[PDB]
Each structure stands twice: as C-alpha cells, then as structure tokens.
Amino acid sequence: SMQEEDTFRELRIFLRNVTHRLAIDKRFRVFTKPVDPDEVPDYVTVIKQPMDLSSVISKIDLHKYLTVKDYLRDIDLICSNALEYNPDRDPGDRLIRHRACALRDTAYAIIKEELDEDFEQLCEEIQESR
Ligand SMILES: [Cl-]
Numbered sequence: 001s002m003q004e005e006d007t008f009r010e011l012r013i014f015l016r017n018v019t020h021r022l023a024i025d026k027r028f029r030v031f032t033k034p035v036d037p038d039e040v041p042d043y044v045t046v047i048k049q050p051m052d053l054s055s056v057i058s059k060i061d062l063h064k065y066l067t068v069k070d071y072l073r074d075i076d077l078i079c080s081n082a083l084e085y086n087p088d089r090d091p092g093d094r095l096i097r098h099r100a101c102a103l104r105d106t107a108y109a110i111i112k113e114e115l116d117e118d119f120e121q122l123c124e125e126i127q128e129s130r
Contacts (some may be wrong), residue, residue, distance in 0.1 A: 006128050007065060015060050015071050018110050023053045025106070027099050031078050045087055051077040062123055066127040067113060068120050079104040 023032050032053050035043040043050065051074050065071045082100035086093040 006061070006077050007119075007122055007126060010119070011065065011068070014115070015065060015068070015126060017058065018071075018107060018114075019053055019056050019060070022103055022107060023057075026038075027054070028103050030096065030099065031082075031103055043085065047081045049081070050078055053078070066098070067123045068115055069124070072111070074109065075104055075107045096097065 010098060022028050034050060034052050034055065035047075037044055056071070056074055059074065060071075065074075079100045082096050086096040088094075
C-alpha cells in the first residue's frame with residue numbers, strides 16, 4: 001500500500017541521516033569509500049563482501065533495506081571486515097580495528113536513542129508479509 005511505501009520512505013530518510021552522521025566523523029574517513037584495488041590488491045581476495053558507507057548510501061537509495069536490522073548487518077560487516085583484514089598487533093591495524101568498532105558502536109548507540117521500537121517492529125512485519 002501507499003502507507004507501507006510511506007513507512008519505508010521514513011526508514012530511508014532515517015538511515016540516510018544516521019549514515020551521514022557517521023560519514024562526516026573524521027575517525028571514520030577510511031570507511032567512507034571502497035578500498036582502492038591499487039593501494040590494496042589483496043583486499044578483494046581476502047574480503048569477500050566489502051562494505052563502506054558510500055555503498056550503504058547506494059543501497060538505501062536502491063531500496064535494499066526494509067528494516068534497521070538489515071542496515072545494521074551491513075554496519076556489522078564494515079566492522080568485521082576490518083577485524084579480519086587488519087588483525088595484527090601493530091598500531092596501524094589496532095587503530096583501524098578501534099575505528100571500525102567505534103563506527104559500529106556509534107551506529108548502534110544512535111539507533112538505540114533515536115529509533116522507535118514500534119517503527120522497527122512495523123517495518124519487520126511489512127517485510128515478513130512480502
Ligand atoms: Cl589518521
């Protein structure tokens with residue numbers, strides 16, 4: 001229905017705003033764009049489902065997220081990709097891991113404070129009905 005379309009449009013606007021707040025934080029610059037296969041030719045070979053915040057925006061705009069739970073699975077991938085690709089004790093790896101954990105924690109904290117649980121429940125039930 002059009003009311004359901006209105007619900008998903010409000011979801012899209014909410015997710016666009018959370019993603020923009022993450023993308024303008026200087027800590028998260030490395031997560032804003034895909035990894036350049038020049039700088040890092042092994043990336044695409046190690047990480048099978050690359051994800052970054054620009055890809056998340058394109059997904060929102062393609063109507064790929066019908067719930068905040070699905071959006072958070074992609075935020076979780078940005079985090080787990082960096083834990084897998086940068087697992088060493090050296091400070092460059094530790095700094096990327098801490099930034100990727102902080103991204104994830106920040107997205108979950110904004111959602112805890114600003115997502116109404118009944119709005120998420122509605123999205124989940126429309127999705128499950130499709
Ligand atoms: Cl830096």
